[PDB]
Symmetry: C3
Subunit: 202 residues, 3 copies
C-alpha cells in the first residue's frame, strides 16, 4: 500500500547531514525537472509543541515525556500526508527529513513506528551515514543545533548501529527499500546525486 505520489523518508543520526543533503537534492531535482515536496518531520512536531507552550527549541522535543512525544509524532505524520496530498500528483515525490531512531530521555525511540508508517506508506527509507568521527566533527562545527546529548563519537556510533536496525524493522511494514547513502566529508552534492538515482528506480 502506496500513495499516488512516491514517499521517501530520509533518516540518519543527528549531525550526519540529512537537511544538507536534502537541500542539495532539491537543487538537483529542480535542474532535472523532478517534482519534490520536502518537509521536516521535527518542524511539524515543533509547530504543535510551541502552540501548546511545551518547548521553544527543536532539540528539546526529545526531552518531553514520551506519551506527549507520541501524540506530537502521530499528529505530525497526519498533517504531513494531508499537505503532501494537496501539493503532489502521481509524478511527485514527498521527501521527509526525519529519524528512524530518536535518543530520548526514556531510551532509543522509533521515529517510524507502525502508526507513522500507516500514514506515510514509504516507498523508501534512505539512511544517510558517515563515520562516527565525521558526524562528531560536523556536530562540533554546527553551533546552530544542540547535539551534545547524542554522546559524541561513542554515542553516535551506538545510535547509528541501533538506527540501522530500526530502519530495517520499519521497512518490513510497507515493503520500503532501505537505501544507504554515504555522506562523505565535503561531498554532500554526490550523496544527493546517489539518492536521486535510487529515487528514480522506485
Amino acid at each position: 500500500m502506496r500513495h499516488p505520489f512516491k514517499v521517501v523518508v530520509v533518516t540518519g543520526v543527528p549531525g550526519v547531514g540529512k537537511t544538507t543533503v536534502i537541500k542539495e537534492l532539491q537543487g538537483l531535482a529542480e535542474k532535472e525537472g523532478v517534482k519534490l515536496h520536502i518537509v521536516n518531520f521535527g518542524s511539524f512536531m515543533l509547530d504543535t509543541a510551541v502552540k501548546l507552550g511545551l518547548v521553544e527549541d527543536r532539540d528539546k522535543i526529545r526531552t518531553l515525556p514520551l506519551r506527549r512525544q507520541l501524540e506530537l509524532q502521530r499528529e505530525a505524520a497526519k498533517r504531513i500526508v494531508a499537505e503532501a496530498s494537496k501539493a503532489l500528483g502521481g509524478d511527485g515525490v514527498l521527501i521527509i527529513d526525519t529519524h528512524a531512531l530518536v535518543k530520548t530521555v526514556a531510551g532509543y525511540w522509533p521515529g517510524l513506528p507502525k502508526h507513522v508508517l500507516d500514514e506515510l506508506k514509504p516507498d523508501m527509507i534512505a539512511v544517510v551515514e558517515a563515520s562516527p568521527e565525521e558526524v562528531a566533527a560536523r556536530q562540533a562545527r554546527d553551533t546552530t543545533r544542540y547535539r551534545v546529548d547524542i554522546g559524541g563519537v561513542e554515542g553516535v556510533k551506538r545510535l547509528m548501529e541501533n538506527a540501522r536496525a530500526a530502519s530495517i524493522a520499519s521497512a518490513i511494514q510497507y515493503a520500503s527499500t532501505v537505501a544507504i547513502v554515504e555522506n562523505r566529508e565535503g561531498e554532500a552534492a554526490k550523496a544527493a546525486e546517489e539518492l536521486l538515482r535510487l529515487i528514480k528506480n522506485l
Copy 2:
C-alpha cells in the same frame, strides 16, 4: 496505543540478571512511592504448561513444540493484561520480566511478536545487558536454573546480538522506547536506579 497504566517489558539473555535488577527496582520504587505491578511472563506460561502436564520446569518450556509454545505465549500475555488492569490505575507501572528472543529447539523465537505486543502495548522495552563473560559466570554460579543450552560465552554473545535486533523490531509496533540498562558486576542496584529514572520519563 497505550494502556491507562505504563507498561515496561524487561528483556535480556538468560542469566544477565533481569529478575535480580527487577527485585532491586521493587525496593527502590516502594522507597520513592512509585506504584509497580511486577509479573514474570515465563511464570504465566509455566502455570498453564504444568496444568496441561507438559513440563514441570520453567527451563523446559523452550523445548516444547513451537505451536504449543505459541498458544502458551498468547494466553500468558492476555492473563497478564487482565491482572494488571485490576491491580493498577493511571499512576501505576506494569513491569514484565521476559525475553525479546528465546533460544528454542526450532531456533531463536520472538518473545514480543505482534500478537503479544497487541496485548501489552509497551511504553518501553528495557534491554538488560552485561559482557558475555559476565553473563556466562552469572549462569555458572546460579545452580537454581538450567542455562547450559544457551551455549556459554559464545552462545550468549550471539543470542545478545539477535535479541538486541528483536527488541528494536518489536519496538516499531507500538513506538516503545528501547532502553539499554548495563547490569555491571556487583551493581544490580545501580542498574535498577538507571531503569527507574528512564521509567519516570515515559
Copy 3:
C-alpha cells in the same frame, strides 16, 4: 496465526546455497517419510514478469521499478499459498526458497514484508549462512546465475548483516522462529540435516 500445514521460509544471500540445501532436504525428507511441498518465490515472480514481457531472466527481476516488483511479490505470495493449500494437509511442510532482503536498483528491499507474511504466516524463517569469502567463491563457480551486482565479498558481507536484521524484523509479525543454518563448504547435506531437525520441532 498459522496455516494447517507448517510453513518454512528459507532465506540467505544470493549464492549461499539455499536451492542446493533445499534439494538435499528434499532427499532426506522423502527418505524419512516427511511430506514437503517445495516452491521458489522468485520462480513465481518470474512466471508473471515473463507473461507481462517485463524480463526474461530471474536475475533481472530486482532491476524492475520497485512498484512493479511490489505487485509481482504480492501476487507470488498469494499463488504460493493457494497451491500449497491444495497440495498439503496438516502433516505437511511448505518450503519456500526465497530472500529476507533483495539488493534492488532502489536499495535493500524486504523479501518478507508484512503483506507477504500475512499470506505465508511462517512457522520458521531459516537463514542459510556461510563466510562472505565462501559465498563469493560459490557465486564465481556458478556461471548459470548473474550475481556480480551483489558486490563480491564486501557486498555479500553487508547484505548478510542487513538480511539477518530483516529476518528478525519479519519474524516479529507471526512469531516465526529464526533458525541460522551454516552451509559449510562441501557439507550441504549436513546443513539439510540440521534444518530438518529444527523443522521437526515446529
